[PDB]
Design a binder for these strands. Structure first.
Length: 220
RNA sequence: CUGAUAACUUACAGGACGCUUUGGCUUCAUUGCUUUUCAGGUGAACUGCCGAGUAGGUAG
């Protein structure tokens, strides 16, 4: 049952339609008859979880920060550069809550598309349609824990920047560096359930990119 | 105007006990290094006395 749980989680590649949706209801619990139960309260909890699904995690280094980001990189950079626009943007995850990391598994596991994108079904679609709200940014720069960077834009002018970690990139460097032990540099983060769903998959070990061997110096 | 601004990882420790590597052995035949070769600066710092003197002193 763990190999079935790791597959719907975003740090594994993707994977009968009657079998799959009964799994996703049982993942929200902390059997085929537990799926047939339809609590009204359960639905509005899962509706909140598709709201706080995020493309890029503001709360990466610091778990006390607060924000929602569901955008795509603006424009396309040249071939000698690399960012989140070149890799296909679908490994997105859930944040903002520790109690609802299980209840987000119904509408955000994204078996490539996502389920979040009789009377209850009509009502559920209306909430999802009105509360999908594609491509939002909700940050307040007043009382939270963000980084702020001024760079000389154009001339005699500056722009403040706040870098945010990208979840499609973190899944890409983690999955590919399983084989290479030489170029991987594991960094561990505590309070894993507060971080997000994308940290609970790897357990805290994020598997960074280490620059080959040690530095040496020819006489130049 | 720097993933900006701020930042004490600390304490304690017995790896030990035991140990046969050995036996045998043919490196060996042959052999032409040869030919030719100016180191020069020496005009000069001499001639007497004393002394038993290959000793040792002094005169112009």
């Amino acid at each position: 049952t763990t190999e079935l749980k790791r597959a719907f989680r975003p740090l594994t590649p993707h994977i009968n339609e009657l079998d799959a949706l009964t799994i996703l209801v049982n993942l929200t619990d902390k059997a085929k008859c537990k799926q047939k139960l339809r609590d009204e309260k359960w639905w509005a909890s899962c509706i909140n979880c598709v709201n706080y699904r995020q493309s890029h995690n503001p709360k990466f280094p610091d778990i006390r920060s607060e924000g929602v980001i569901r955008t795509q990189a603006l424009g396309e950079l040249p071939s000698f550069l690399l960012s989140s626009s070149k890799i296909p943007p679908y490994h997105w995850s859930y944040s903002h809550d520790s109690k609802y990391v299980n209840k987000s598994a119904f509408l955000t596991n994204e078996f490539i598309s996502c389920l979040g994108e009789s009377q209850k079904t009509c009502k559920a679609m209306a909430k999802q349609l009105a509360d999908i709200t594609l491509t939002t940014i909700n940050v307040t720069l007043a009382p939270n824990y963000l980084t702020q960077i001024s760079l000389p834009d154009s001339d005699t002018s500056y722009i403040s920047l706040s870098p945010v970690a990208s979840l499609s990139m973190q899944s890409h460097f983690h999955q590919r560096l399983q084989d290479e032990n030489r170029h991987s540099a594991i960094t561990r983060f505590s309070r894993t359930t507060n971080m997000g769903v994308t940290a609970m998959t790897c357990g805290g070990a994020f598997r960074m990119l280490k620059s080959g061997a040690k530095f040496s110096s020819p006489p130049h």
